[PDB]
């Protein structure tokens, strides 16, 4: 495939336009008072939306290059969200702010490498300032606080989160299920979650969450790399006539059997999904046996002689639910006997007596934790089905912000925190005069989100900006009600993680661009 | 798929032209004296029509964007009709009136957010004014009144509705069937209706109603999510050789078996249709058992061990009719034994003794209501088949306006009510001078329907408008006979619901547009 | 405007221009609101005849050499 190669300025100009289109489409939705974007849909009536994540998803341009620009900012802003729970749009909005101004600078004839240095410093500095502005969120009161705010003034959502964390810990695994009655429920149940994601996006059966939700499936606990689909035919035919889904946990699943299971589900007979086993090497042995115990399943080790062709349902584990996403698997309510699960705990607890390393002690402890520590489930109750799966959605939203608030605290939400940290470090210098421009570009970028919220509301940016700057701490403007005050008191907050992630991620991609000299892509 | 992105003004101009083509094509048909639109039809001679709903359905434009404009108004105006029973055209006509004038304003350089505020106030105010102008319709006399008027002076149609409501209540379910003789019939019969619609439009066998009419079918009452077509083969082969249709009510039906059943009917052997079960969770258990009892069918619960592969006709329910639409299923005349249906009633009635919540008491009451309350059927009698299915049509029209008249009353029907409420709130102000413009745009939009009716008749709009304004209450112009008078006395009325809905819906889409800054769609 | 301003006092031509672009922008927006231009004019004119009196009231004589140097300088 012959390529089209663009250099230095050309390359960058293309990139700039690319990112502007992304940002100009996505940014008009930022405030509590965003504007709508209309998103066409092949069949039927179009989609009107104020949701930046939705708009972004749709952005792809004809001019490759220009497209690359847009796609780059999209990638990184989505990672922000990935790591924090929000900021996708903010990250984009800031990404544009640096990219525009920095990229003008380079084109004016200033030094790219210095401009990046300056920005990177301004960010490093503001990140610190953010930690300072940050108000911790630690006690049950504070947990429920950010929960309720994040769930839109609903005090009962704040409660349920606070209660869950109060039961299984700030670390413990909390999931959300559909409610059976009008009543909310909180139950703790034998279960577990491990940092391993789906082997294929085509496993997703809930497109809106980018997640795999499987109803009381059997669980296959293999120990080899599943490459051939042949080993499957006995077990995949039993879990077919059992009319139930099937979760596979093994070393891996290679294309040969992966791509088959893929097309086998996406419009096909048995609907299933598979994920890699937790841990590597000597750890995975016992780490997999833990899940076995928890689900009352049998581990099919090759090192024992058993094959997958020599496996029936009686070998498969079982759990009342299981959700998989990009990079997490969590199984809910394992049928494994209490006498067994408590027995395994006693075995591992004893093994901690070894204490040959603070790595081995801490590693065996993480295993005790997952197993006997369990998974807390929230069932969201509501009156109507519409209300239900809507409330259920805000509960997941709040849980997200709360986990994040715990880790790094909360700050002024209106763009405010960024506007604040910026007016703090307004002396900042570098060595190059070029690095100064770098710091300033970055600093002035930090006003973008507030300025934009205000603008979307149809108020003057400069004027609200100026008066937010005129204050201190978390004093800001609440665009929804047009009153200045303490943003946190007024219930307009962002978890510290998210404001930071957003900024850092916007800064990364901007630096990357400011330092790009070549761009390679296919011919039109 | 690379998109084409348009901003601010561009986006809006495109949208405007889109909407104008829709409205200019659809509005010429509004009065009692509409003009014809000719609608081409691939094979055979074209269609000449004065029916705005028919014209609208056909409108789709080449220019995407322009198209999105048109599709947007179409969507919202159809919802008007969805919730009220009429106004599809009116909604469109008004939608154009706001969109034109509001959108010029924004382009002149006035504030969108304020223009929306202004419109939205003007509407809020007029809706109130409408409630004031409104005349109740409550007693049997008034029911039969709006019925007869809505059915074109036919006093017997007004009677039959009044009688039906008089038998099963103002809420009770009333359906219409083809008549067997020359005589009208009204019978009450064991049956039920629940708020759940077809899983696929390709189930529709009466294209003109957008509805599914199935003649004395078997009813399958599953309890699981039907995903695989395999569970079906025994039951779907029995109801094939029985030469009868089949209704499925279960948790859901997933593509795998849905898309198959779809192609299986749309030009295929067994003609069937399926809908989700009423309610969710603990409610659906008994809620589904109710339909079982009513149809004398057996519920196939997975929680008992029975599968669909283990099911014969003896398990399927039966009803003499069943109609499904967008979002309603109603079954007519269930074969379930009287000793059984009355028995179940006794069970539920007793269960109301619990009274642990005003939610549980009221929820068990809604169940008693559906079951022992029944469905009233009107059989439309006529001399000829043409007359028959024509009278049958007006009976359904009338029933629509009457259900609506009961809920919210009636008002002057020639546009008149709108013209009236507008000249009332002709002082209304906002804070922004821009908000004023908003109010005025909206107010003057409210004259659109009358002005248009008059125009279509070939009379002067301004002159008729002015003299309708000059009066009070329900004084208006009757374009059919060209006399002024009391519109209600003269038998030209709209249910209050429909005039309101029309207005609100037109106002929603207009504001949406006045606040659209970006438009994303596929490349030409 | 810019040209007449200049024949009149040989200064302020940009100001003048700026003011005109401003009256016009705003005025046209009001014509688009459906106001009667001839009245928009009368209002503008009334506003101005008034503004001119106001100015003659704020004016203080410039007669010392320091003040003269100040207008020169600013110019
Ligand atoms: Mg000068």
What is the 3-class SS of B152-163, one letter each residue?
CCCHHHHHHHHH
Distance CA B340, CA B348 (A): 12
Residue among B328, B289, B280 nearest A382 (CA): B280
φ/ψ of A439, rounded to 5, equals -60, -50
Strand partners, B483: B478
Separation of CA A153 and ligand 1 centre (Å) = 57
Q: Is the dihedral of CA B275, B279, B281, B285 positive or negative?
A: negative
3-state secondary structure of A188: strand
H/E segment holding residue B101: helix B88-108
Tell whether B486 lies on the interface with A, counting CB pairs under 8 A.
no
Q: Is B478 annotated as a binding residue?
A: yes
Separation of CA C68 and ligand 1 centre (Å) = 15
Residue among B222, B181, B185, B154 nearest B394 (CA): B154
Tell whether C55 lies on the interface with B, counting CB pairs under 8 A.
no
3-state secondary structure of A213: strand
* DSSP codes of every residue in A449-502: HHHHHHHHHTS-HHHHHHHHHTS-TTEEEETTTTEEEETTTTT-EEEHHHHHHH
3-state secondary structure of A410: strand
A38 and B517: CB-CB below 8 Å? no
Question: Is residue B278 a contact partner of residue B285, using CB atoms and an 8 Å limit?
Answer: no
Provide the token pair at A130.
Answer: 């953010």
Chains that touch B (3 or more CB pairs under 8 A): A, C
* DSSP codes of every residue in B200-242: -GGG-SBTTTTEEEEES-EEEEE-SEE--STTTHHHHHHHHHT
Q: How far is A117 from chain B (nearest CA, A)?
A: 34
Residue among A10, A20, A6 nearest A106 (CA): A10
Distance CA B404, CA A310 (A): 67
3-state secondary structure of A99: helix
- Coarse DSSP helix, strand, coil percentages of chain B, rounded to the nearest 5 percent: 50, 20, 30
Provide the token pair at B96.
Answer: 């154009």
Tell whether B434 lies on the interface with A, counting CB pairs under 8 A.
no
Distance CA B19, CA A55 (A): 23
What letter does residue B34 receive in the DSSP assignment?
P
Distance CA B449, CA B506 (A): 12
Return the residue matching tokens 């004084």. B475
Distance CA B488, CA B465 (A): 18
A58 and B520: CB-CB below 8 Å? yes
Helices (H), B374-425: 385-408, 416-424
Nearest to A458 among B4, B114, B281 (CB): B114
The experimental technique behind this entry is X-ray
Residue among A491, A501, A469, A480 nearest A412 (CA): A491
Q: How far is B108 from chain C (nearest CA, A)?
A: 6
Distance CA B521, CA B509 (A): 19
Distance CA A219, CA B308 (A): 25
Tell whether B132 lies on the interface with A, counting CB pairs under 8 A.
no
Closest-CA residue of A relative to B308 is A243
Distance CA B498, CA A105 (A): 60
Tell whether C28 lies on the interface with B, counting CB pairs under 8 A.
yes
Residue among B313, B318, B336 nearest B241 (CA): B313
Question: Is residue A6 a contact partner of residue B487, using CB atoms and an 8 Å limit?
Answer: no
The answer for B482, left when phi > 0, alpha when psi is -120 to 50, beta otherwise, is left
The answer for B485, left when phi > 0, alpha when psi is -120 to 50, beta otherwise, is left
Provide the token pair at A117.
Answer: 């240095």
* DSSP codes of every residue in B444-464: HHTTHHHHHHHHHTTS-HHHH
Tell whether B110 lies on the interface with C, counting CB pairs under 8 A.
yes
Residue among A225, A272, A270 nearest A246 (CA): A272
Tell whether B105 lies on the interface with C, counting CB pairs under 8 A.
yes
The answer for A289, left when phi > 0, alpha when psi is -120 to 50, beta otherwise, is alpha
Q: Could you count the other beta carbons within 10 Å of the beta carbon of residue B121?
A: 18
Question: Is residue B92 a contact partner of residue B53, using CB atoms and an 8 Å limit?
Answer: no
What letter does residue B306 receive in the DSSP assignment?
-
User: In A384-400, which positions are buried (b, 16+ CB within 10 angstroms) versus exposed (e)?
Assistant: eeeebeebbeebbbbbb
CB hemisphere CA count around B3 (13 angstroms): 25
Tell me the domain boundaries of chain A.
1-134+410-524, 135-190+372-409, 191-371
Q: What is the CATH number of domain B191-371?
A: 3.50.7.10
Distance CA C42, CA C40 (A): 6
Tell whether B104 lies on the interface with C, counting CB pairs under 8 A.
yes
3-state secondary structure of B493: strand
> Cβ neighbours of residue A164 under 8 Å, at least 6 residues apart?
A172, A174, A186, A376, A378
B3 and A178: CB-CB below 8 Å? no
Interface of A with B in 167-186 (CB under 8 A): 178-182
C33 and B104: CB-CB below 8 Å? no
Closest-CA residue of A relative to B4 is A61
Question: Is residue A160 a contact partner of residue A382, using CB atoms and an 8 Å limit?
Answer: no
Burial class (CB in 10 A: 0-12, 13-18, 19+), B334: buried
Residue among B16, B102, B116, B100 nearest A457 (CA): B116
Chains that touch C (3 or more CB pairs under 8 A): B
User: In A456-471, which positions are buried (b, 16+ CB within 10 angstroms) versus exposed (e)?
Assistant: bbbbebeebbeebbeb
Question: Is residue A474 a contact partner of residue A463, using CB atoms and an 8 Å limit?
Answer: no
Return the residue matching tokens 């509705």. B161
| Cα three-residue angle A394-A400-A401, rounded to 5 degrees | 95
Residue among B319, B412, B396, B449 nearest B52 (CA): B449
B281 and A25: CB-CB below 8 Å? no
Q: How far is B257 from chain A (nearest CA, A)?
A: 10
Best residue in C29, C30, C35, C43 for a mutation probing chain B (most B CBs within 10 Å) = C29
Q: Which residues of C touch B433 (CB under 8 A)?
A: 33
> Cβ neighbours of residue B207 under 8 Å, at least 6 residues apart?
none
What letter does residue B381 receive in the DSSP assignment?
-
Distance CA A79, CA A327 (A): 13
Q: Which residues of B touch A267 (CB under 8 A)?
A: 255-256, 259
In chain B, which residues are followed by a C-to-N distance beyond 2.5 Å, i.e. a gap?
Answer: none
B512 and A48: CB-CB below 8 Å? yes
Q: Is the dihedral of CA A132, A138, A142, A147 positive or negative?
A: positive
Q: How far is C59 from chain B (nearest CA, A)?
A: 34
Helices (H), A37-150: 52-58, 66-84, 88-108, 112-133, 140-150
| Cα three-residue angle B432-B436-B437, rounded to 5 degrees | 110
Distance CA B109, CA B121 (A): 21
Q: Which CATH architecture has domain B135-190+372-409?
A: 2-Layer Sandwich (3.30)
Interface of B with A in 138-167 (CB under 8 A): none
Question: Is residue B215 a contact partner of residue B246, using CB atoms and an 8 Å limit?
Answer: no
The answer for A218, left when phi > 0, alpha when psi is -120 to 50, beta otherwise, is beta
Residue among A330, A326, A246, A343 nearest A289 (CA): A343
> Cβ neighbours of residue A162 under 8 Å, at least 6 residues apart?
A140, A141, A143, A144, A147
E strand intervals along B273-366: 273-276, 299-300, 317-325, 328-334
Distance CA A11, CA A14 (A): 5
Q: Which residues of B touch C28 (CB under 8 A)?
A: 108
Q: Which residues of B touch C21 (CB under 8 A)?
A: none
Provide the token pair at C16.
Answer: 């003048």
Question: Is residue B93 a contact partner of residue B27, using CB atoms and an 8 Å limit?
Answer: yes
Separation of CA C50 and ligand 1 centre (Å) = 24
Question: Is residue A191 a contact partner of residue A331, using CB atoms and an 8 Å limit?
Answer: yes
CA Rg, chain C, in Å?
Answer: 16
Tell whether C35 lies on the interface with B, counting CB pairs under 8 A.
no
> Cβ neighbours of residue B468 under 8 Å, at least 6 residues apart?
B416, B419, B420, B450, B475, B476, B477, B484
φ/ψ of A471, rounded to 5, equals -95, -155
Provide the token pair at A428.
Answer: 């900042």
Q: Is the dihedral of CA B140, B146, B148, B151 positive or negative?
A: negative
Calculate the alpha carbon distances from A450 to A102, A416, A446, B372, C41 in Å: 20, 6, 8, 60, 39
Question: Is residue A16 a contact partner of residue A520, using CB atoms and an 8 Å limit?
Answer: no
Q: Which residues of B touch A268 (CB under 8 A)?
A: 256
Which residues are in the CB-under-5-Å shell of ion ligand 1? C 11
Calculate the alpha carbon distances from A128 to A73, A86, A132, A134, A424 in Å: 24, 20, 6, 10, 11
> Cβ neighbours of residue B41 under 8 Å, at least 6 residues apart?
B47
Q: Could you count the other beta carbons within 10 Å of the beta carbon of residue A282?
A: 8
Instruction: Tally DSSP H helices, then E strands, for chain A.
Output: 18, 21
> Cβ neighbours of residue B423 under 8 Å, at least 6 residues apart?
B469
* CATH superfamily of domain region B1-134+410-524: GroEL-like equatorial domain (1.10.560.10)
B109 and C34: CB-CB below 8 Å? no
Rounded to an integer, what is the distance from CA B402 to the centroid of its chain? 13
* DSSP codes of every residue in A232-264: THHHHHHHHHTT--EEEEESEE-HHHHHHHHHH
H/E segment holding residue C32: helix C13-32
What letter does residue B5 receive in the DSSP assignment?
E
Distance CA A523, CA B130 (A): 62
Distance CA B320, CA A245 (A): 38
Interface of A with B in 289-348 (CB under 8 A): none
H/E segment holding residue B501: helix B496-514
Strand partners, B404: none
Burial class (CB in 10 A: 0-12, 13-18, 19+), A54: middle
A36 and B1: CB-CB below 8 Å? no
What letter does residue B253 receive in the DSSP assignment?
E
Provide the token pair at A472.
Answer: 């201190």
> Cβ neighbours of residue B42 under 8 Å, at least 6 residues apart?
none
3-state secondary structure of B249: strand
Q: Is C11 annotated as a binding residue?
A: yes
Provide the token pair at B238.
Answer: 């029995």
Q: Could you count the other beta carbons within 10 Å of the beta carbon of residue C26?
A: 12
Calculate the alpha carbon distances from A303 to A187, A313, A497, B240 in Å: 38, 21, 44, 54
Question: Is residue B327 a contact partner of residue B196, using CB atoms and an 8 Å limit?
Answer: yes
E strand intervals along B110-184: 173-178
CB hemisphere CA count around B136 (13 angstroms): 4
3-state secondary structure of A404: helix
What letter does residue A517 receive in the DSSP assignment?
-
Distance CA C32, CA A418 (A): 40
Calculate the alpha carbon distances from B313 to A70, B250, B322 in Å: 59, 17, 18
Q: Is the dihedral of CA B452, B456, B459, B460 positive or negative?
A: positive
C32 and B440: CB-CB below 8 Å? no
B280 and A38: CB-CB below 8 Å? no
Distance CA B488, CA A11 (A): 71
């Amino acid at each position: 495939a012959a390529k089209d190669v663009k250099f230095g300025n050309d390359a960058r100009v293309k990139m700039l336009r690319g990112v502007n289109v992304l940002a100009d489409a996505v940014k008009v939705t930022l405030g509590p008072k965003g504007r709508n974007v209309v998103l066409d849909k092949s069949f039927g009536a179009p989609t009107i939306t104020k949701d930046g994540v939705s708009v972004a998803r749709e952005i792809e341009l004809e001019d490759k290059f220009e497209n690359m620009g847009a796609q780059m900012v999209k990638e990184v802003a989505s990672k922000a969200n990935d790591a924090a729970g929000d900021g996708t749009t903010t990250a984009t909005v800031l990404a544009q702010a640096i990219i525009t101004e920095g990229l003008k600078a380079v084109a004016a004839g200033m030094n790219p490498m210095d401009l990046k240095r300056g920005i990177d410093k301004a960010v490093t500095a503001a990140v610190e300032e953010l930690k300072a502005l940050s108000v911790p969120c630690s006690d049950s009161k504070a947990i429920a606080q950010v929960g309720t705010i994040s769930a839109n003034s609903d005090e009962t959502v704040g409660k349920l989160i606070a209660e869950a964390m109060d039961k299984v810990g700030k670390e413990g695994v909390i999931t959300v299920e559909d409610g059976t009655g009008l009543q909310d429920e909180l139950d703790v149940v034998e279960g577990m979650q491990f940092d391993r994601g789906y082997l294929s996006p085509y496993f997703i059966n809930k497109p809106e969450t980018g997640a795999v939700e499987l109803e009381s499936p059997f669980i296959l606990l293999a120990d080899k790399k599943i490459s051939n689909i042949r080993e499957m035919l006995p077990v995949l035919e039993a879990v077919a006539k059992a009319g139930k889904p099937l979760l596979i946990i093994a070393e891996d699943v290679e294309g040969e059997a992966l791509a088959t299971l893929v097309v086998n589900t996406m419009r096909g007979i048995v609907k299933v999904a598979a994920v890699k086993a937790p841990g590597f090497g000597d750890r995975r042995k016992a780490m997999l046996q833990d899940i076995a115990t928890l689900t009352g399943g049998t581990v099919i080790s090759e090192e024992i002689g058993m094959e997958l062709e020599k496996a029936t349902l009686e070998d498969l584990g079982q759990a009342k639910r299981v959700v998989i996403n990009k990079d997490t698997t969590t199984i809910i309510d394992g049928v494994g006997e209490e006498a067994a699960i408590q027995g395994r705990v006693a075995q591992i607890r004893q093994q901690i007596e070894e204490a040959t390393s603070d790595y081995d002690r801490e590693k065996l402890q993480e295993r005790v934790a997952k197993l006997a520590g369990g998974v807390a489930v929230i069932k969201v109750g509501a009156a109507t089905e519409v209300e239900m799966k809507e409330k259920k959605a805000r509960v997941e939203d709040a849980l997200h912000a709360t986990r994040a608030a715990v880790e790094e605290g909360v700050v002024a939400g209106g763009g405010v925190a960024l506007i604040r940290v910026a007016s703090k470090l307004a002396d900042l210098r570098g060595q190059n005069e070029d690095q100064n421009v770098g710091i300033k570009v970055a600093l002035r970028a930090m006003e973008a989100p507030l300025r934009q919220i205000v603008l979307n509301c149809g108020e003057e940016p400069s004027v609200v900006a100026n008066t937010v700057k005129g204050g201190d701490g978390n004093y800001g403007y609440n665009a929804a009600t047009e009153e200045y005050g303490n943003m946190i008191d007024m219930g307009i907050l962002d978890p510290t993680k998210v404001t930071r992630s957003a900024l850092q991620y916007a800064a990364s991609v901007a630096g990357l661009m400011i330092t790009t000299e070549c761009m390679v892509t296919d011919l039109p």
